[PDB]
Amino acid sequence: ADPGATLCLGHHAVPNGTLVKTITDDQIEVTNATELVQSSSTGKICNNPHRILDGIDCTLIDALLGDPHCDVFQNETWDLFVERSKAFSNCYPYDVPDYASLRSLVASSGTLEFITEGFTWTGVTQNGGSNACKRGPGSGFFSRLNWLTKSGSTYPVLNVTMPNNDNFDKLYIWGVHHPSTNQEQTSLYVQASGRVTVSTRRSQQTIIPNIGSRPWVRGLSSRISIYWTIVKPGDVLVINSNGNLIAPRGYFKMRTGKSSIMRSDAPIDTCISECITPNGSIPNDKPFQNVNKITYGACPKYVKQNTLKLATGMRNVPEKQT
Amino acid sequence: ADPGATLCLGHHAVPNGTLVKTITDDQIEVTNATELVQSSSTGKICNNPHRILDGIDCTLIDALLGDPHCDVFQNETWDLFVERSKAFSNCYPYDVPDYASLRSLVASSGTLEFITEGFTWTGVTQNGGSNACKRGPGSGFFSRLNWLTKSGSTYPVLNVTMPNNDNFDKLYIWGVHHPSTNQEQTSLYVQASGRVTVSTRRSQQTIIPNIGSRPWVRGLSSRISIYWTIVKPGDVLVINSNGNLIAPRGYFKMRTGKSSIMRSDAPIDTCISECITPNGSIPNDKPFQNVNKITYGACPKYVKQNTLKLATGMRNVPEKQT
Amino acid sequence: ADPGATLCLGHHAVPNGTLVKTITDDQIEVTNATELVQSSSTGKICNNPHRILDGIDCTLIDALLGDPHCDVFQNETWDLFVERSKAFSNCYPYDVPDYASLRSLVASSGTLEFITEGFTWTGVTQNGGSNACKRGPGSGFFSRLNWLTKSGSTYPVLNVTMPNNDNFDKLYIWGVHHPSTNQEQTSLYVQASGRVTVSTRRSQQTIIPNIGSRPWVRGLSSRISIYWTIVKPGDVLVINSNGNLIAPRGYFKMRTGKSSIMRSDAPIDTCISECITPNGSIPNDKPFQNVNKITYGACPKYVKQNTLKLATGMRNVPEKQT
Amino acid sequence: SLEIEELARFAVDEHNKKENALLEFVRVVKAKEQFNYDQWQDYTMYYLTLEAKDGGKKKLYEAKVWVKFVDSAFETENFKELQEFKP
Amino acid sequence: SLEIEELARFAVDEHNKKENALLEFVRVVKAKEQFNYDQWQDYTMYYLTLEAKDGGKKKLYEAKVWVKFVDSAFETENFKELQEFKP
Amino acid sequence: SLEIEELARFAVDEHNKKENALLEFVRVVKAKEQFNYDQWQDYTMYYLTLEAKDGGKKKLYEAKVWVKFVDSAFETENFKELQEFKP
Amino acid sequence: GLFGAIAGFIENGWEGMIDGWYGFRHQNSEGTGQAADLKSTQAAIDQINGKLNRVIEKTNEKFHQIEKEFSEVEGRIQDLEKYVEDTKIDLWSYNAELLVALENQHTIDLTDSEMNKLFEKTRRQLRENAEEMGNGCFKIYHKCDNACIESIRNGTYDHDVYRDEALNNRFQIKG
Amino acid sequence: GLFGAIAGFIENGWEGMIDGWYGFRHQNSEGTGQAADLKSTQAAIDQINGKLNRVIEKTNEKFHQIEKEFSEVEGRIQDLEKYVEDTKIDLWSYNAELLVALENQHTIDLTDSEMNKLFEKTRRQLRENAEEMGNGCFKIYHKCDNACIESIRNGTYDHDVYRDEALNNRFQIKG
Amino acid sequence: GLFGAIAGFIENGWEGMIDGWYGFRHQNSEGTGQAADLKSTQAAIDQINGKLNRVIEKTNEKFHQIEKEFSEVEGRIQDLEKYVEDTKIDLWSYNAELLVALENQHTIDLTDSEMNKLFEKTRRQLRENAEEMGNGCFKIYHKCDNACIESIRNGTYDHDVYRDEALNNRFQIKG
Ligand SMILES: *[C@@H]1O[C@H](CO)[C@@H](O[C@@H]2O[C@H](CO)[C@@H](O[C@@H]3O[C@H](CO[C@H]4O[C@H](CO)[C@@H](O)[C@H](O)[C@@H]4O)[C@@H](O)[C@H](O[C@H]4O[C@H](CO)[C@@H](O)[C@H](O)[C@@H]4O)[C@@H]3O)[C@H](O)[C@H]2NC(C)=O)[C@H](O)[C@H]1NC(C)=O
Ligand SMILES: *[C@@H]1O[C@H](CO)[C@@H](O[C@@H]2O[C@H](CO)[C@@H](O[C@@H]3O[C@H](CO[C@H]4O[C@H](CO)[C@@H](O)[C@H](O)[C@@H]4O)[C@@H](O)[C@H](O[C@H]4O[C@H](CO)[C@@H](O)[C@H](O)[C@@H]4O)[C@@H]3O)[C@H](O)[C@H]2NC(C)=O)[C@H](O)[C@H]1NC(C)=O
Ligand SMILES: *[C@@H]1O[C@H](CO)[C@@H](O[C@@H]2O[C@H](CO)[C@@H](O[C@@H]3O[C@H](CO[C@H]4O[C@H](CO)[C@@H](O)[C@H](O)[C@@H]4O)[C@@H](O)[C@H](O[C@H]4O[C@H](CO)[C@@H](O)[C@H](O)[C@@H]4O)[C@@H]3O)[C@H](O)[C@H]2NC(C)=O)[C@H](O)[C@H]1NC(C)=O
Ligand SMILES: *[C@@H]1O[C@H](CO)[C@@H](O[C@@H]2O[C@H](CO)[C@@H](O)[C@H](O)[C@H]2NC(C)=O)[C@H](O)[C@H]1NC(C)=O
Ligand SMILES: *[C@@H]1O[C@H](CO)[C@@H](O[C@@H]2O[C@H](CO)[C@@H](O)[C@H](O)[C@H]2NC(C)=O)[C@H](O)[C@H]1NC(C)=O
Ligand SMILES: *[C@@H]1O[C@H](CO)[C@@H](O)[C@H](O)[C@H]1NC(C)=O
Ligand SMILES: *[C@@H]1O[C@H](CO)[C@@H](O)[C@H](O)[C@H]1NC(C)=O
Ligand SMILES: *[C@@H]1O[C@H](CO)[C@@H](O)[C@H](O)[C@H]1NC(C)=O
Ligand SMILES: *[C@@H]1O[C@H](CO)[C@@H](O)[C@H](O)[C@H]1NC(C)=O
C-alpha cells in the first residue's frame, strides 16, 4: 500500500502588511513591523520615579534667585526642572552674560541645598528690594542675594575671606549692577566706575559695569549681571569690591550627580515613567523616536525619519490569487 | 536519437578591468566600476539655476559696505557670493571682532535688500569719507554707513529709537573707531575715551575703543571695528553714544532662506549646474568627491580617498589562458 | 573487494574558549580570540624613536619660560613633553587667559629653538627677578622674558619695530602685570591704569590689567598674564605700551610639524616604542584600547568596552560528551 | 498725608539723634517726588520741605530721605535713611 | 593756489556769518599742511595764515579749517568747517 | 650690618654722581624694611636713615632705595637705584 | 533573501497560521491539515529577539546635555553648536537608516536561511526520498499518514523503512 | 562570493558578452551559440540600481556651514573646529570605505546569489537531468536543439518528456 | 553561521587538530587517521588576515589634539568640548561594536562558508558517490585506502573508476 502525498513547507502571511525599507530596494512590505519610531505623546509630565520640580509661573534661574511669587522652591532637591512657556520675571529684569553655562551648571548640580554663612560685611546696609517684586502690598526682592548699597555717606572697600576647611565644593552666585544714567550709579554707590574683584588661588575675575539708557521692561531700564565662583577643597576665596555690589548670603552646595533641565508646557500628572521628552513624556520601549531632540533620562535619541519599522517578521506575500 | 550536449553557464568578462576594494581583501579588480569620487573639475563657475553674484575686485563684507569701486552690488539678491583671490580693500582698513560670525550671518541672510529710515541725529554732520576710497578724482567712502563726527565745537549725546511695528526682523550694522594717537581721538570727537551703548529689551552691548600706533596699510594706521544688532518683532532698539560713532543709515532685511559664501578664483560662465565647489564647479552624479570640502548646494561631501570605485559589476575574471 | 568507509569532515575544538559577542546573540564562545582592546600597561615611558622631553619638577609653560630650577630645557627640541603630577611652580605665580590655547599651540610648535633679537628699548632697565625664583643663594627669575620696570623717575612710552624680512614665522611671548594694591602699580610704573598695545597689519590687541587683593601663593598675592603674537612672512609687528610690560628678548621659531603634550607620572626608560599613553606606554599591535583617551603617536583610540575579542577562529563546540 | 508726616518725623528724630539736640515737627509744606526718569522699582527719594519751631523761629529744611525698598516680611522692614539735612 | 584762497574766502565768510560783521580777504601768507603723523586718508587740516584790511589795518589770523573728506557725488560734497579763528 | 652700610655707600655716591657733590658716610641710624602687605618675592625697599658729616654739620637723610631683585648670574647682578634722596 | 528561499520560489503564504511562523502544510489521504513546527520557529524568535533586546538598549543615558534648539542667532559658536548637533543627526540617522537596512537584509536572510535550514533538514533527513519540486515545497514519495507529521515535526524520523519504498517510485522501469 | 559562485569554480568569463551580464553559452549539434538570458540580468540590474539611486541621494544638502579651512591659528576654538571637521571626515571616510566594502561584498555576493539562483533554477527545472560537473557549468544529458535554449531562457520548460531520457544515460547497466 | 555549517549539524569538534583549522578525519580498514587539509585552511587564514591587517591600520595618527579630560568646570565651551568628546566615543564604540559584531557574524559565516565549500568540493568531486548523511560529515560508498585521503586532500581525484561498481551500493535490488 503506497501513495503519493506532500509535505509542502512555507510560511505565514497576513493581508494587513506594513511597508518597510531594504538596502537593495526602496519600499517593500512585511508580515509584522514594530515602529522603532516614537512620534506619539501622551502629553502628561509624571513625577515618578524621578523627582520632578515643576514651576507655575517660575523659571530655574529665578527659582534659585527666589522670585517673590515662587517661594515654594526653598531647598526642594530635584531631578528635572520643567520651565513653563507662559513664564514672566517680575523681579528686576536682568542680563546675565554667558547664560547657557550658568543654567547648565546649576541644572547639573541637582539640588538647591542652601546654607547661610556668617559674612562680616562692614559699612554696608544689606536687604534692598524693588517694587515690581511683590508678595502683596509693599515691596519685595529676590530671596537669596543681598542688594548691597551705601550707608551714611560713604562706601568702604570690602575684604571678606571664607576658609573652606570642609570636604565639599562651594558655589557663590553674586552679581553686579548696571545702572541707566550716571545719577543712578552715583546715588546708590559713591563710585563713578565701580570695580568688583573675585579671587581664588587659581584664577581671578574683574568686571567693570556699563552705563547707558535702555528700553523699559516693567519700569526703570536698568539690569543686573550675574557672575559666579567655585571653591575647591582647601581653597580660600577673597571678595574685593569698590562698588556695584550684589554679594551673596550663602554658598550653594554642589553635587556630582544626575540632573537635567527642559522646556515644555505640559502639566503635571501621576505615573511611573522614566523618560521625559518635551511636548509629551513618552515611554521607552523602542530604540528611536521623532519627538523633540531635548531628552532627560535613559530613553532614545532623535532620528529624522518617520517610519523606520524594523521587521520583526518575514517578507509579505499577499494571498495570490482570488 | 539521443546526444550529450552542454548548457554551460557563466558570466561576462572584459580585459580592461579596474581595481576595487573589499573588506576581506586589499586590491581586487572588477568588470565595471563607477568612480564615486569626483576629483575632476571643469573650472567654470556657472550662474544658473542658483543666482551667483561674483565680484571682480570685491569681497562680501566690502560689498555690504559699498566699496567705492564695487557699486554694482546695490540690492542684487544672491545665492552664493564668490570672493576673488586677487582682492583688495581700498577703503579705510578695518578689524572686525568675531569676523567669522558676521560673514556667516550675512551669507545666511541671502539678500542685500536695503531700506533707508528717517533717523533724527541731532548735533552731528554725517557723510564723511577718506582719500584711499576713490571713484575717480576727489574723495570717497563706504556707501552704507555714516562716518559721524563733531559739529561746531561740541558733540551732544545721542538718543535714538526705532519702533519695529512690522512683522519682519531688522539688522543694524554700525561701528566703532580706533584712532592711532590721542590727537586723533581728541580732534574727531571730544571724548578722550568714547563710549557706545546699544540696547534692546533682551540684551545690551557696551564697547570702549583702543588707542595705539599700528603699521601702515595704505596710509594712516587707524582701524574701525564693526558691530551689529538684531531686533525681533515688537521690539525697540535704543542706540546711545558718547563718542566714536559710525551709525547706519538704514536697516538690512533678514531672510530665513538658503544661501552660502565661498572662496575661489575661477571666472564666470553660462551653464545649468547645481553644485558649486571652489576650484571647479562640478556636476553631482556621484555620492562622493575629492575636491575641496567647502560646498554650496545639494552635492556630495569630502572623503579623503581617491579611488572609491563602487562595483557596478562582478569580480573580474581575465580570459585565462592564452 | 568493496567496503564502506567514511571521510567525516569537521573542525578543531579547544576546551579553553573565550566569550565573544555577536549581533544575533549576547555571549558565545569561540576557538580563538585576539583581544583588540589594550587595557594592560607596562608603565615605562621610553625615549625612542620619538624624542621625549621629560621634566623632573618642571611643567611645559614654565619650561619655555625658563624656570630657575629647570634650566636644562634650553633649546632641546622634542616630540612629546611629559609633565609630572608632582609639579610645582616656584617662579611668581601667574594666570594665563585662554590657557588651553597657548599650551596647545606651543606643544604643536615642536621645537623650543630660541634666538635673540636686538631690541632697542629706551628708558628702561630690564632683567628683574623675584625671591621665590631661586638658583641657590640670592635671587632668580624666568630666563626668557624681561621684567621691565621704571628707571630714574619717569617712564617713557615705547615704540619698537621688527621687520620680518625672512621666510619663517615669529612668535613673541610677552606679558601683562596684575598688581595687588594700588601702591604696587604706582611704585613699579608711573601709570595708575596701564595700557599695552600689540599691532600687526592684520589684527591688534589692547589689554587693561586688573587690581585687587588675592590669597597668598608663595608670598605676595600678585599675578602676571601671558599674551602672544604671530607674525607672517613679509609682516611687521609694532609693540606700543604705556605701562605694565613684560617684553620678550627674542622670537620663538614656529614649525608646522608633529608634536603633542601629555600628563602622566611614569618615569623614563629605554625602549623602541611608538605609542605613548599616560599611565603606561603600551605597544600598538591591536586597533582598540581601554587605557586613557589622551594619546600621541600612531596608536589606537578609546573604546569604553573591556572584552572586544575579534574571533580569529570559529565557534567553540566543547567536546561533548564525557 | 500720613506717609509724608511719618517720614518728616523720621528725618527730624534721626537728625536729633545725630547732632545731639532737640527739634520738633510742625507740618509739611511740599512733598515733590522726583519724576526725571524713573521713581518706581528702585530708590524713590522724597523731596521733603519742612519748617520747625524749635528756637522760637521758623526754619526751612530739605531732606533727601533715600527710601530704598526692602525685601518683604521674610526679611527686614521699615527702610529709610537721611542722606543730608540741609537748612 | 586756488584751493588755499577759496578756503580763505570760506574762512572769512563763515567767520563773517557768525559775529554779524564784515571782513574782506586780501591774500594768503602761509599754508602749512601738518605732517606730524598723517595728513591723508583722513582730516587734512590746513594751517592757514591770513591778513585782512577791514578796519584800515592789517590783522593776522590762523584758521584750523577741519576739511574732512565726504563720500563722492553719490552723497554730499564740498565739506569744510571752521574750528576756531584766532586773531 | 654690612648690607645696610653698603647701600648707604651706594646712596651717597649716587647722590654725589647725580648732583656732582662730595659727601662722606658716617653710620646708619635706622633701617626699617616695610611690612605693610609684602616685602618678599618683589621690591624690598629699605627705609634707610643716614647722617652725613660733610658741611661742618650732621644732616639727616632718608633714601628710598628701590632694590629690585635681578635674575641670577645667567643675567646681570647688583641691582639698586635711588628713587629719591630727601634731606 | 540572498538564498532565495522566500519570494524566490514560494508565491503565496497562508492565513490559518496564527500560532507560528514556519508552518507545515500537507495533503494526505486522512485530510488537509496544518501544524506549526514549534522548534523551528522558536529558534527564529530566539534569534529575532537576540537582536531585538540588543537594540532596546540603544538609548542615550545622558542626564545633562547641551542646548538643542535656539531662539537667537549669534554666529560662530551658534553655528558650531548647530553643526555638531546637525552632523550628529545625519550620522545617527544614516546609522539608523543603515542599522535598519542590514537587519531587514538580515531578517529576510534569516527566514531565508531558516526556510533553507528547514529545507535541508527535511532533505538530509530523507536525502533519497524528499525530491524537490522547485516550487519551494517538497514532495514525499512514500505512503504517509498522521504518524508522518508527528515525527517530522520533532527531531526523530527513521530513514530505513521508508528509504526502500520512495526510491521505487522515483524510478520508472522501461518496458 | 561567500557562496563561492564567481571565481570559486568558474575560472574564465567570455568576451562576446556585450548585451548582458549572465550569459548562457552552449555547444550542440547545430553549432556554438551565445544567448544572454534577459530576465536573469534584468532583475540583477534592478537590484544594483536598487542600491545605486539609494546612494545617489547621499549628498549633504547644507546651504550654509562653518569654516572648513583657515589661514590663521588661534588655538582652542580653532582646534575644536578642526577636531570636529577632522572627526567628521574620518567618520565619513570610514563610512564611505565601509559602504564601498560592504556593497562590494554585497555585489560579489549578489552576483554570487544570482549565479546560484540561476544554478538552482536550472537545477530545479530538471532535478534529475542537470547533473552538475563542479566547473560552474552544467551538463544536460538528453538530446538538445535550438528549442532547448529558447525554452530554458524563458520560464517555461517541461520536465516530463525529457525526464525519461536523461535518467537513462546516467545509468550504466553492468553486463 | 547562516549557512548552518558549523553548530547546525556538527555537534563536536576535536582535540587532535593542532596544525590546522579544517580537519579530515576518517575511519578505514588501515586504521583511524587525521590529516589537516593545508590548502583549505590556507585560504581561510589568508581570508582572516585579509581583514586583520585591514583593521590593524585603524589607529588615529593624530599628533596634536584637544583636551580629553578636565580638572575644572566652566560650562558652555566645557560641555561642548565634553559633548564632542562623548559623542565621538559612542560613535566609535558603536562602530567598534558594529565592527566586531559584523566580523564575528562575518567569520562564523566565513568559516561556515568553506565548510560548505569543502562540502560542495567533496560533493562536486563525486556528485554520485559522496552522499550526505546530514550530520555534517560525509560517507564514501566505495573501497577506500590511504590513496583516498592523499588524493582528496589535494586537488586531483578521478571520478570515473570509483563512480562505477559507489552507485552499486547506493542501490538495494529487490528480490
Ligand atoms: C531715550 O530714548 C528712549 C526710547 O525708548 C526713552 O525711553 C522711553 O521713555 C518714555 C518716558 O521717558 C517711555 O514712555 C512711557 O511709556 C510707558 C508704557 O507705555 C504704555 O502706556 C502708554 C500710555 O501712555 C501706551 O500708549 C503704550 O502703548 C504702552 O501700553 C507709560 O506707562 C509711561 O507713562 C504713561 O502712562 C502712565 C500710566 O500710569 C501715566 O501715569 C503717565 O502720565 C503716562 O501717560 C510713559 O509714557 C517709553 O516707553 C520709553 N521707551 C520704551 C521703548 O519703553 C528714554 O526715556 C530716552 N531717554 C531720555 C533721557 O529721554
Ligand atoms: C612707531 O613705529 C612704527 C614702526 O612701524 C612707525 O611706523 C612707520 O612710520 C613711518 C613714517 O612715520 C613709515 O615710513 C613711511 O613709509 C612709506 C612706505 O614705504 C614705501 O616707500 C619707501 C620709499 O620711501 C620704500 O623704500 C619702502 O620699501 C615702501 O615701498 C613711505 O611711502 C613714506 O614716505 C616716503 O615716500 C613718500 C612717497 O611719496 C615720500 O613723499 C616721502 O618723502 C618718503 O620718502 C614713509 O617713509 C613706516 O612705513 C612706518 N612703518 C611701517 C611698518 O609701515 C611709527 O611712525 C612710529 N610712531 C611714531 C609716533 O613715530
Ligand atoms: C584681605 O583678606 C585676605 C584674606 O585671605 C588677606 O590675606 C591674608 O593675609 C594674611 C597676612 O596679611 C596672611 O597671613 C599670613 O599667613 C602665612 C601662611 O600661614 C602659614 O603659617 C601660619 C603660622 O603663622 C600657620 O598657622 C598656617 O596654617 C600656615 O601654615 C604666614 O606665613 C604669615 O606670617 C606668619 O608666619 C611667618 C613665618 O616666618 C612669621 O614670621 C610671621 O610673624 C607670621 O607669624 C601670615 O600670618 C594670610 O595667609 C592671607 N590669606 C591667605 C588665604 O593666604 C589680605 O591680607 C587682606 N588684605 C588686607 C589689605 O588686609
Ligand atoms: C531649606 O534651606 C535652608 C537654607 O537656606 C535650610 O537651613 C539650613 O539647613 C541646614 C540643613 O540641616 C542646617 O544645617 C542649617 O543650620 C540651616 N540654616 C538655617 C539658617 O536655618 C533649611 O533647613 C531648609 N529646610 C527648610 C524646611 O527650611
Ligand atoms: C536698491 O536698494 C535701495 C535701498 O537702498 C532701494 O530703495 C528702496 O527700495 C524699496 C523697495 O521698493 C522701496 O520701498 C523704498 O522706498 C526705496 N527707498 C529709497 C530711498 O529709494 C532701491 O529701490 C533698490 N533698487 C534700485 C534699482 O535702486
Ligand atoms: C506579529 O504578528 C502576530 C500575528 O499576526 C501578532 O499577533 C503580533 O502582535 C505581531 N507582533 C508585533 C506586532 O510586534
Ligand atoms: C511638540 O511641540 C514641539 C514644539 O516645541 C514641536 O516641534 C513638535 O513637533 C511637537 N511634537 C510632535 C510629536 O509633533
Ligand atoms: C583646487 O585648489 C585648492 C586650493 O584652494 C586645492 O586644495 C585643491 O586640491 C585643488 N583641486 C584639485 C582637484 O587638486
Ligand atoms: C591609569 O591611570 C589613570 C589616571 O589618570 C586611570 O584613569 C586609568 O584607569 C589607569 N589605567 C588603567 C588601565 O586602569
Numbering used by the authors:
A (entry chain C), B (entry chain A), C (entry chain B): 7 to 328
D (entry chain I), E (entry chain G), F (entry chain H): 5 to 91
G (entry chain F), H (entry chain D), I (entry chain E): 1 to 175
Show the paper's wording.
Hemagglutinin (HA), one of the two glycoproteins of IAV, is responsible for virus entry into the host cell. HA comprises two domains: (i) HA1, which includes the N-terminal domain (NTD) and the receptor-binding domain (RBD), is responsible for interaction with host receptors such as sialic acid and for entry into host cells; (ii) HA2, which along with N- and C-termini of HA1 constitutes the fusion domain, is responsible for virus-host cell membrane fusion through conformational changes triggered by the low pH within endocytic compartments that IAV hijacks. Affimer molecules are small (~12 kDa) proteins based on naturally occurring cystatins (cysteine protease inhibitors). Affimer reagents display two variable peptide regions that allow binding to a target in a similar manner to mAbs, with affinities typically in the low nM range.
To further identify the HA epitopes of A5 and A31, cryo-EM was carried out on each HA-Affimer complex using a trimeric form of HA (HA-HK/68 H3), which has a 98.6% identical sequence to the one HA from A/Aichi/1968 that was used to isolate the Affimers. On the other hand, HA and A31 were pre-incubated for 15 min at room temperature, prior to spraying. This procedure led to reconstructions of HA in complex with A5 and A31 to global resolutions of 4.4 Å and 3.4 Å, respectively, with imposed C3 symmetry. However, the H3-A31 complex was resolved to sufficient resolution to enable model building into the EM density. In this model, the two variable peptide regions of A31 appear to straddle the 130-loop of HA, which is directly involved in sialic acid binding, and suggests that the mechanism of action of A31 (and similarly, of A5), is through competition with receptor binding. The interactions of A31 with HA highlight multiple contact points directly (G135, W153, K156, W222, and S227), or in immediate proximity (R141, G146, R220, and R255) to HA sialic acid interacting residues. A5 and A31 showed Kd values in the low nM range (2.80 ± 1.15 nM for A5 and 5.94 ± 3.27 nM for A31), demonstrating high-affinity interactions. Mean IC50 values of 1.05 nM and 0.35 nM, respectively, were obtained for A5 and A31, which are comparable to those observed against full-length HA, suggesting that the binding of these Affimer molecules is strictly localized to the HA1 head domain. Affimer molecules were assessed against these strains using TCID50 assays. A31 maintained high potency, although somewhat decreased, when challenged against A/Udorn/1972 (H3N2) [TCID50 of 18.22 nM vs 0.96 nM against A/Aichi/1968 (H3N2); Fig. 4D]. Overall, these results suggest that the mechanism of A5 and A31 inhibition is based solely on their blocking of sialic acid-HA binding by interacting at or around the HA RBD.
